[PDB]
Swiss-Prot record:
The keyword Transport applies. NCBIfam families: PRK09474.1. It comes from Escherichia coli O157:H7. This is Maltose/maltodextrin-binding periplasmic protein. Part of the ABC transporter complex MalEFGK involved in maltose/maltodextrin import. Binds maltose and higher maltodextrins.
Length: 370
């Protein structure tokens, strides 16, 4: 059983736990309640194990996608923020923490892919994907490529495929319809074809992956790449002068990147749910609370409007939120895994030529709706 009278918080080792402990200090200073921050190894696997026996931390931080599984097992308490607090966060972030019609966690941060570009090579990046082929021809004239990004993970290629109509699961009033999948439709077809054509026309290579693209951009060999806030620190050290902007549109429609929302759930077995709510709502989700964590390790964009408005002074973060609002929250249902694997295969096969675009998407679709 969990100890009453204090708060134990679990957050991953790559997050700003030292910064979070700073908020815990303020909480104890005001309430006299001690807050302990821990970052155990493989905590995403450990949590469901210990929470299943009625133990574990009072609060757990992790990408919202993982919370769907936890909520299915009844590991998370339904939260009770009032309307006043709900208005404080962007609407789409609340959708990311809803399972079976119930709010099961508090949104903290927001992450999505953006277009990263070299200001010296391309001071005026393209607003459309259609402009890229011509830009590549001009840049190649001087030994540089227009764009290089990870083509091995569907997470990176989907923004393009979704632009004109592709989608994983239709999200209606309440939840996701596992029977309405949009991988084998006109929009996805047009998007994947554009991607495959970039390859066949030599504007991109089917084998380009994360590390290949990262080094190419960091060495000034390619003018653009597509990546998230987590990659910025590994560019800053290269000195290259880069900018971060909205993803290019396709067929006049904005690219739609998936969105990940770092969230904080409350253990269903915690005898400290009220303390957890007080801490999360009135200490962490405030300008001062998020600043403490962010100052330690950047959160990227955040769910709290007031602080996001301040953070947006950084064009990289403003761009992150802009793309996020045009994208879609990653579905938190079990079937999303089937989606990732089926689509990963479709893109790889279509790009290598093993399958035609139509065959690739048809097979992915038929598999996902099983
Ligand atoms: O390159 C490092 C990345 O892991 C960083 O994470 C960021 O990018 C990944 C995409 O690579 C993104 O993950 C999301 O999309 C992938 C699908 O591309 C999902 O993976 C599932 O499908 C895979 C098959 O394609 C399969 O191998 C996995 O096991 C499946 O889980 C993820 O589930 C989904 O979350 C991250 O969201 C994004 O943050 C890196 O980890 C940073 O987060 C931290 O440096």
């Amino acid at each position: 059983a969990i100890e009453e009278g204090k708060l134990v918080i679990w957050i991953n080792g790559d997050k700003g736990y030292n910064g979070l402990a700073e908020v815990g200090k303020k909480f104890e200073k005001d309430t006299g309640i001690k807050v302990t921050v821990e970052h155990p190894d493989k905590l995403e696997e450990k949590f469901p194990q210990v929470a299943a026996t009625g133990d574990g931390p009072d609060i757990i931080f992790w990408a919202h996608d993982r919370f769907g599984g936890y909520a299915q097992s009844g590991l998370l308490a339904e939260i009770t923020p009032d309307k006043a607090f709900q208005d404080k966060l962007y609407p789409f972030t609340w959708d990311a923490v809803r399972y079976n019609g119930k709010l099961i966690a508090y949104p903290i941060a927001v992450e999505a892919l953006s277009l990263i570009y070299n200001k010296d090579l391309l001071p005026n990046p393209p607003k459309t994907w259609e402009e890229i082929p011509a830009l590549d021809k001009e840049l190649k004239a001087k030994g540089k490529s227009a764009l290089m990004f990870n083509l091995q993970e569907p997470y990176f290629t989907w923004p393009l495929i979704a632009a004109d109509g592709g989608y994983a699961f239709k999200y209606e009033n309440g939840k996701y319809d596992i029977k309405d999948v949009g991988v084998d439709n006109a929009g996805a077809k047009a998007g994947l074809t554009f991607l495959v054509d970039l390859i066949k026309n030599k504007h991109m290579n089917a084998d380009t992956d994360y590390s290949i693209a990262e080094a190419a951009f960091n060495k000034g060999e390619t003018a653009m790449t597509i990546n998230g806030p987590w990659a910025w620190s590994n560019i800053d050290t290269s000195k290259v002068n880069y900018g971060v902007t909205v993803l290019p549109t396709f067929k006049g429609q904005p690219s739609k990147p998936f969105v990940g929302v770092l969230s904080a759930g409350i253990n269903a077995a915690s005898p400290n749910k009220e303390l957890a709510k007080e801490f999360l709502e009135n200490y962490l989700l405030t300008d001062e609370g998020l600043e403490a964590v962010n100052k330690d390790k950047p959160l990227g964009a955040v769910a709290l409007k007031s602080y996001e408005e301040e953070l947006a002074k950084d064009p990289r973060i403003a761009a992150t939120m802009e793309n996020a609002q045009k994208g879609e929250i990653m579905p938190n249902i079990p079937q999303m895994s089937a989606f990732w694997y089926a689509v990963r295969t479709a893109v790889i096969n279509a790009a290598s030529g093993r399958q035609t675009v139509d065959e690739a998407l048809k097979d992915a679709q038929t598999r996902i709706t099983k």
